[PDB]
Structure 1
Amino acid sequence: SMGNLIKVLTRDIDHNASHFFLDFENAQPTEAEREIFNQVNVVLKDAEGILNDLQSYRGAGHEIREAIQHPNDENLQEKAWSAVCPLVGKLKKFYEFSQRLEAALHGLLGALTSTPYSPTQHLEREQALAKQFAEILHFTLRFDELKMTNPAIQNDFSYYRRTLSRMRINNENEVNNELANRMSLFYAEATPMLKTLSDATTKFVSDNKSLPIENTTDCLSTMASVCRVMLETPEYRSRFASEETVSFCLRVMVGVIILYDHVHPVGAFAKTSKIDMKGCIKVLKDQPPNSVEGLLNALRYTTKHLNDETTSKQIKTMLQ
């Protein structure tokens, strides 16, 4: 069923491009998937809009530097303020969309990690919900890759917090200090959406104490092995791996790996891990370097157990 699971996750994504929501007629969920598929699909419909706003994030570095250069010129102070406020509005909408990702993740984890079935049978039984989980990770990695290449995001928000505080001394859709602190910890992360999704998966394990942990962890490791085997085998590469399919699976694999490393007690690098770390890193290495550097940075920074003394030197040196 390893070939079937590949045909399930990599199904109808070639003719698909940049769309994170699943077509209802194409995915064809079962009766037991309808109430969750509908909820998750609404969040996935907005994921494309969130990602497009991040691509259009030009930043206010030019106006900020000019205002700081001439701090007595009120026209330049208001020109920078008029430019950075709609951008902080976008940053506000991105962080609030991260909270919606946590809700849609618990609906998927709640169904894909039931007590009786195995991970392999869950991805085959609840095929539509398994596709949505991969699409949530797809957007998560694609969002965090843009954030890493856009240094104006943290500079715009830091200048906002400095100017706000001291403007409401000297001088509705405004941001409060309580929300700003959570946004600052959000954008200080190398992978903001993935860190959030990582905590949400840890929350799911704690909310379901009566649920065994491998029902969640082996679901992530199965998805990692489905993507790894598809990408590393040429027999399966000439059958399924295309431009959009490889880029999709590369990001689904890195997503579940980091989730696994935070939820699985010993991590994804220990001897008892079920993720082929060397094989997953190698697949990233055989890819063109520029298109995967964001994913490699995720495996080097968002990881919990990478720098452990129990962790191997081969992968440690593999990620150098």
Structure 2
Amino acid sequence: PTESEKEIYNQVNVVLKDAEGILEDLQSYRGAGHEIREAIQHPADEKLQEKAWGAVVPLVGKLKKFYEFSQRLEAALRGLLGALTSTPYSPTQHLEREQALAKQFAEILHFTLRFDELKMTNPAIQNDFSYYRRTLSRMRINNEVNNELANRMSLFYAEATPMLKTLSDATTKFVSENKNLPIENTTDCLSTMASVCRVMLETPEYRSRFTNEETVSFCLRVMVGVIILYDHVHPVGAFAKTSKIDMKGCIKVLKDQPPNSVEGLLNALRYTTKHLNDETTSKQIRSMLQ
């Protein structure tokens, strides 16, 4: 255990304990839909405007929290990748370190997908911040969320899967500043994790210690996580017929789950992927995703 690597483990662990609180905040996000729709439709009504404002300021407090955290997560991940791609694989000598770094990467992706699932099912978030930004521009007449931050946040929340796109960008950037390392070291981290996830899902017998909702829910979300990172940073990507990812098998295990459990995860594959809409991707895997 290096001082550098205990610093990354320290850093990421603070980040990951905060991550459950972020999920709490997002889960309890009411939205200001009602207030805004009425305020907008009766713009002379000075009372309906205070209401909409009152309701929106707290929510944009959370939206700022979420976005700021995404920057912390972004950095935490590129931390992990640096550490967890540099030294070769050692099952005998240095396993505890690898297992520990693998654990934290998986836990990042578990949060990431859970956050994005809830975002995609929240009708309010984009409209809330849209109303905020215009009402901010009214109050600035008579005279902190500065303009350029707000433009970044607007784009963040325009994303189907904000957190996951943040992380695919963060992974694309990592390979970029480490052209010295072969691409395989990163791609093989993602591909092994994807494959191990599939094993834990597929290999266990019916009704063993391995087949609890907690395990299945976790492994599905890590799998889809790393599949999509891989799709972005692997030249040929995840959808090519002889890709080490076997997308077809990954989608099939998703299709095997209760519909409402994994519809968020299927949408991530639809929207936040790079190579899905390619002439060279199986019309069968297209078929499955429409």
Change (3 A) 1:31 1:96: closer
Change (3 A) 1:123 1:223: farther
Structure 1 residue 167, shift from structure 2 partner: 3.2
Q: Residue 305 of structure 1 aligns with which residue?
A: 275
Equivalent position of 1:139 in the other structure: 111
Contact map agreement 1:112 1:119 (CA 8 A) in 2: no
- Runs of 4 or more off by more than 4 Å in structure 1? 29-33, 118-125
Per-residue deviation at 1:161? 1.4
After superposition, the C-alpha distances for 1:244-303 in whole angstroms (9 at most, x for unaligned) are: 010000100000000000010111011452101111000000000001100010011101
1:101: how far off? 0.4
In the superposition, relative to structure 1, how do residues 68 and 122 fare at CA in structure 2: closer, same or farther (>3 Å)? farther
Q: Is 2:80–2:105's contact at 8 Å kept on the other side of the alignment?
A: yes
Give the Cα separation in 2 of the matches to 1:289 and 1:142: 16
Tell me the distance in 1 between the aligned counterparts of 2:213 and 2:136: 45
Q: Is the 8 A contact 1:33 1:128 kept in 2?
A: no
Higher relative contact order (CA 8 A, sep 6+): 1
- How far apart, CA to CA, are the structure 2 residues paired with 1:243 and 1:186? 31
Distance 1:269 1:101 in 2: 27
* TM-score with structure 2 setting the length: 0.94
Q: 1:121 to 1:209 in 2, by over 3 A?
A: farther
Give the CA deviation at 1:73: 2.1
For the residue of structure 1 that corresponds to 2:95, the secondary structure is helix
The answer on whether the counterparts of 1:201 and 1:263 sit within 8 Å (CA) in structure 2 is: yes
Q: How many residues align?
A: 290
Give the 3-state SS of the residue equivalent to 1:103 in structure 2.
helix
Q: 1:176 corresponds to which residue?
A: 146
Identical-pair percentage:
95
2:122 equivalent in structure 1: 150
Q: Is the Cα contact below 8 Å between 2:191 and 2:227 reproduced in 1? A: yes
Q: Deviations over 1:20-41 (max 9, x none)?
A: xxxxxxxxx8887422211100
Q: 1:223 to 1:122 in 2, by over 3 A?
A: farther
C-alpha distance in 1 between matches for 2:264 and 2:239 = 20
Report deviation, 1:75: 2.1
Query: For the Cα contact (< 8 Å) 1:115–1:211, is it kept in 2?
Result: no
Counterpart CA distance in 2 for 1:254 and 1:212 is 23
> 1:115 Cα deviation (Å)?
5.0
1:121: how far off?
A: 9.4
Alpha carbons of 1:116 and 1:129: their partners in 2 closer, same or farther (altered >3 Å)? closer
Of residues 196-205 and 262-271 in structure 1, the stretch that sits farther from structure 2 once superposed is 262-271
Report what 1:84 is aligned to: 56
The 1:209–1:277 alpha-carbon spacing in structure 2 relative to 1, beyond 3 Å, is same
Could you tell me how far apart the structure 2 residues matched to 1:164 and 1:47 are?
29
Structure 1 stretches of 5 or more lacking a match?
A: 1-28
SS at match of 2:129: helix
Counterparts in 2 of 1:319 and 1:124: CA distance versus 1, 3 Å = farther
Q: Distance in 2 between matches of 1:119 and 1:302?
A: 34
What SS does the corresponding residue of 1:113 show, helix, strand or coil? helix
Distance apart, 1:233 and its partner CA:
2.3
Per-residue CA deviation, residues 154-183 of structure 1 (Å, 9 max, x unaligned), is 110111112222332377xx3121111100
Change (3 A) 1:125 1:85: closer
In structure 1, what is the equivalent of residue 189 of structure 2? 219
- Which region of structure 1 is more displaced relative to structure 2, 103-112 or 135-144? 103-112
Match of 1:36 in 2: 8
Superposition CA RMSD, Å: 2.2
SS at match of 1:292: helix
8 Å CA contact retained: 1:217, 1:264? yes
SS in 1 for 2:201: helix
Going from structure 1 to structure 2, the CA distance change for 1:120 and 1:92 (only over 3 Å counts) comes to farther
The structure-2 alpha-carbon separation of the partners of 1:276 and 1:84, relative to structure 1 and needing over 3 Å to count, comes to same
* Per-residue deviation, residues 14-67 of structure 1 (Å, max 9, x unmatched): xxxxxxxxxxxxxxx888742221110000011011110001100111111221
Judged with a 3 Å threshold, the aligned counterparts in structure 2 of structure 1 residues 297 and 216 are, in CA distance, closer, same or farther, namely same
Contact 2:33 2:128 in 1 (8 A): yes
Deviations 1:166-224 (A, max 9, x none): 332377xx312111110011001000000001100111111111111010001101000
Residue 236 of structure 1: how far off its partner (Å):
8.4
Does the 8 Å CA contact 1:224/1:253 hold for their aligned counterparts?
Answer: yes
Whether the 8 Å contact between 2:241 and 2:282 is mirrored in structure 1 is no
Separation in 2, partners of 1:234, 1:306: 30
Rounded Cα–Cα distance in structure 2 between residues aligned with 1:118 and 1:186: 38
Ranges in structure 2 where 5+ consecutive residues have no aligned partner: none
